[PDB]
Paper text:
Lipoproteins, anchored in the OM via their N-terminally linked fatty acyl chains, are key OM components that play essential roles in OM biogenesis and maintenance of its integrity.
The lipoprotein is bound at the interface between the transmembrane helices (TMs) of [name] and [name] via its triacylated, unstructured N-terminal segment. Specifically, the triacyl chains and the initial (+1 to +4) residues of the lipoprotein are situated in the central cavity formed by the TM1 and TM2 of [name] and [name], with the remaining segment extending outwards from the interface towards the periplasmic domain of [name]. Interestingly, this observation aligns with the length of the lipoprotein segment resolved in the [name]-lipoprotein structures, which spans from the central cavity to the periplasmic neck of TM2 in [name]. The remaining structured body of lipoprotein has yet to be resolved in any reported [name] structure, reflecting the flexibility of the unbound portion. Each of the triacyl chains (designated R1, R2, and R3) binds specifically within these hydrophobic pockets. These specific interactions of the lipid chains and peptide linker to the complex indicate that the [name] extracts lipoprotein in a fixed orientation, allowing each structural element of the lipoprotein molecule to be precisely recognized by different domains of [name].
Numbering used by the authors:
A (entry chain E): 4 to 412
B (entry chain V): 1 to 10
C (entry chain F), D (entry chain D): 3 to 228
E (entry chain C): 2 to 212, 217 to 397
The structure:
Amino acid sequence: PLSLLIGLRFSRGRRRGGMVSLISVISTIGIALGVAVLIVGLSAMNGFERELNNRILAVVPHGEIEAVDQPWTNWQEALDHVQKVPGIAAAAPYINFTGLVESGANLRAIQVKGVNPQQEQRLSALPSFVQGDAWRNFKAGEQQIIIGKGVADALKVKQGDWVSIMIPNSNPEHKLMQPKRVRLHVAGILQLSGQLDHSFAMIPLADAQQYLDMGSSVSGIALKMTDVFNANKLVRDAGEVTNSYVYIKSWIGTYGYMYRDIQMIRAIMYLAMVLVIGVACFNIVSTLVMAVKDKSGDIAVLRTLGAKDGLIRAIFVWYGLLAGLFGSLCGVIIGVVVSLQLTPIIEWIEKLIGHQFLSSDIYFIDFLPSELHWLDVFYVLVTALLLSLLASWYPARRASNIDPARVLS
Amino acid sequence: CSSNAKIDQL
Amino acid sequence: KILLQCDNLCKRYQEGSVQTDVLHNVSFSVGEGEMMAIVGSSGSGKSTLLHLLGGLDTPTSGDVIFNGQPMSKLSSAAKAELRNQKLGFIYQFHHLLPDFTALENVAMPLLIGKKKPAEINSRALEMLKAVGLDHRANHRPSELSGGERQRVAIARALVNNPRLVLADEPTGNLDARNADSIFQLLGELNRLQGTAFLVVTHDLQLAKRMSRQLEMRDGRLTAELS
Amino acid sequence: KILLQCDNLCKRYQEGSVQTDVLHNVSFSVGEGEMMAIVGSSGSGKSTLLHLLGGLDTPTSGDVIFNGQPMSKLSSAAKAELRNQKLGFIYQFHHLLPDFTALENVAMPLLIGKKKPAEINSRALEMLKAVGLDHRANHRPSELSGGERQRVAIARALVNNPRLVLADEPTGNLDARNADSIFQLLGELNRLQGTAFLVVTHDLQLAKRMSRQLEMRDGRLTAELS
Amino acid sequence: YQPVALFIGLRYMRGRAADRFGRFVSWLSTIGITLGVMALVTVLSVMNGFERELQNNILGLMPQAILSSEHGSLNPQQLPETAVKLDGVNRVAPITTGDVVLQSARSVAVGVMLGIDPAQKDPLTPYLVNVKQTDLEPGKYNVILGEQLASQLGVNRGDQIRVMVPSASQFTPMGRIPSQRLFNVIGTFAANSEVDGYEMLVNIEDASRLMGNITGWRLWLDEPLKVDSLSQQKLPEGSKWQDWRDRKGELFQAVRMEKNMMGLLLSLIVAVAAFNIITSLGLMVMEKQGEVAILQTQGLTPRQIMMVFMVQGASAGIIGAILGAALGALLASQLNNLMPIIGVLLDGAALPVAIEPLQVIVIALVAMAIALLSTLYPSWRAAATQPAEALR
Ligand SMILES: *C[C@@H](COC(=O)CCCCCCCCCCCCCCC)OC(=O)CCCCCCCCCCCCCCC
Ligand SMILES: *C(=O)CCCCCCCCCCCCCCC
């Protein structure tokens, strides 16, 4: 049930001339290039966002509470109070160490922490990133330590290797008595996304209690919540059931910049590709103006047979929208095909360049993710179709102003 | 990336 | 009464940055059913006069009244509707669309009028078989010979019951073998439904079958001077 | 001696994936000053013949010698220079540039030759007043009528002292009122500076004023058969 | 009427239907190129502005390049300040460096040591908090910790530390005893950057590492982002060159890669505008076949009718690139000058810009080069066909 406005104007696109096939190829390539890259860029950004919640948000505590320069004596009462908060899912005690590793004629800046192995799997996904067979051998009094992949690569050490690391001497009298070293054997290693690998290590909580010569006392409470984007507020009221003041800190101040640098890239790319499509729309304007002044005889014929102004005005709108739609669909197909196989394409390109980008030293990850959503493809197809309709509007209006009698009808 | 603000929360 | 009335039709044209007078004091009248013929030289303004009667121009010095209604107080949409309803055009340049088939080429006037979907599949091929070209309905103008597709153009205008049919050298390319073949049904249409048609040529040999002779020289049609 | 010599011109053309023979054994000779005329049907290959004499194509089976020099041992630049110096073309399609004025359109052959800058401001309007169109020198082809700007195209080729002038239906659109008016000065050019021009038409009525009759049918021009 | 017959035959062709819309279509390629250049210039200028701030806060506060000796330390007598005249250097000062490990009464930390002469000026001098640079005297073993280094070490003025050098440890035959001393702090420096957590300033004379010589000469650079080009010049014999590409070797390599990626993304506008020229010229060639044939008959060589359409694209590309560069050099400067007309971002950081004169010229030249390159096929097709055998 095709309408007369479109009628058989698709057959009007079956024209013959000189080098007009190459013009059509350029027209369908220039507008398809700006969509196939926008689709894969938005899919790559969606993949980055998906990997951020699986490799950073799931392994980093959302909030941490610790008092001012004071060992805790009523930490259990504070844990009981913070356990019942409308918005906090779980909490666990931990100790912050700043001891350093010196073994193998190299120096490493590491932040050791002490967490309960039975409670460490209830608020984070770090247990799921252990390269070993299992971490269930974590107990108290066995000198067990686990480090990240970066530290293991720097020390060239493996599982079970004995390493002596620096430990601060927690002396009640503020002096510089002696440096402390304790030998620990590696109970496995874990590989993170590629940023916290060389700056994370943890030990059992009870071992850290003995290393500080401290009794039933911990330094910090880490908390995992449900809505991660309200962490700046959920830690404000969580620290209210305490003494006068302890500290307040969340992951927004240290990892919230990554989210701000994902939406910014999306907005920049969308604005940069709307320009690409709009410039490619001039290619439709020129080739439709040429069709208007080449099909002037048929316009006069239709006017003589009684076609109204609206029919002639709308014939070329759908004539241009078909050339735009073909290019858009060809771009959508390419963008979907490349997006679905982006991870192997980038890996194969990096093996051809020799040196690989997206390094695992200062970035967020070491690879290029790609998650395809069937809502950005619709949003870019609609944008391309709207830009094509806008481009093929003024020439269509000019086509309706052709005098049917000035040209011999 | 290359956009650092360095805003800390107390 | 009368069907068409044009008088004091002073049509100008732009020739040398001045509105040269190409038609002046045209006072011809067209009746219902009666067949006339206008004979003039190719360049005396006879071809331009045809577009003025169809509402395709503006004489800016006169008025033409069709069926008791002039085209002055009408918009472009109303003029197009009048052209599609009570008009019909036939030219000598073989003005067809080389993208449509022969069946769909003649259904365009009915397609614009938004008739029944099955009506265009019952009245178009009826006209094609009346003229005798229904076997080549599913073809292309690029395949038909010069004198073959001309009858398709003749029958294109005679679909939506045309009350008045304009013509401009209907027999310009086809030979005389089909000249009487395309005229017998045109004459019969005057007795079947009572339609009127005017034809503008430059030869007096084919005007014998016409019932009137109103040849014009430089916008004046007065007597039988030649 | 003689000015032009073409013999055994077997020009082929691509019609159906095969080089069909459209011209064969063309042995016409052109003298200095004497006027000839070639008459043929529109489709017999008479229009394609003029393109070969101007060095615009390749006969691939013969040779054309102009002023004692064949076109085989010449490059494109040499052929274009010879065309701009001792040639001239007149067509029937009204081949003019609708961007330049009437004064600039006829000065293009002089502009390509890189003559004196004030020479094109003394010889172009001289030709325009010789043909009688200097009043519309600062105009546009979109403004002039059909028969007005044709004389501009006629005078465009007759600027840089053309020794041989090809014509293809010079009187195709303009009427017979100025048909003699555009021929009197062309004839006077033969007795003024001694120029030669050949004209290819399809009618014998306007060939009376020509000094020769070499009508051709399918690449053969032998006698006065008709 | 021009002496060059090629240009006069095309100048009138750049706009022949004077109308409110017909003239606009002929300028579509110029508008597209102008947009592609004005978008390629502004964004890369903003990235250059971020890079300049990053370099002025990291590279400008750390030793950019050092000239040392391959056999450990370098004796100043064998290589004085008069013996160094390397290109791109505007200041040379003795310095000692080393990746030392801290030791406080509460915790331990790491950091690079900068042993400098207290008499000479230092880039970190203005960012001092109640500390006199002349207090760094030999024998007293004074040390100035960073603002973020002492905050995490729990160290205020009047405390003591046990800075140890593992890299330059005195490898005695009786195992391995690291070289260490007892430094007393005199205050902290706050530079409001990332170097306040691993940098501390000490006296130039220190035997905590080796040997009365120095490790090397810290030399300043006018353009510290082109060390890879200055690292191959003729250095004095018996010397080695070190730079910041060992510590900050991936951070500033990331910025260049991100700039190249953003530029490649934005170059698609210019690439599509180049295709627009190809379309606009292929449409003009097929429409002006009779004009081309008449020019060929009048005496115009095919190599001239090729340049007739070549300029039709070249002039549009040049006039688009120049306008795009001029608009990009103005939009970036006036991005937040009168009002922040950007759709104000939720950052509140006074977005910096840095217009590089060489980069704008390079972008404008690549735009012209691609516009000229895209014209080849449409111009060649207008002359490859037979003049008269095709149309007339
Ligand atoms: C961390 C970010 C930093 O990126 C930035 O550069 C921040 C830029 C902020 C710019 C603000 C500009 C404000 C003014 C705008 C004015 C616009 C004017 C427009 C005309 C009027 O990291 C990144 O953003 C990296 C982003 C990478 C994005 C994707 C690049 C994809 C490249 C694909 C190339 C495919 C090539 C295929 C060839 C076949
Ligand atoms: C900035 O502070 C950290 C940014 C971490 C992610 C950097 C990603 C760089 C590469 C982005 C590529 C986007 C397009 C991918 C498909 C071509």
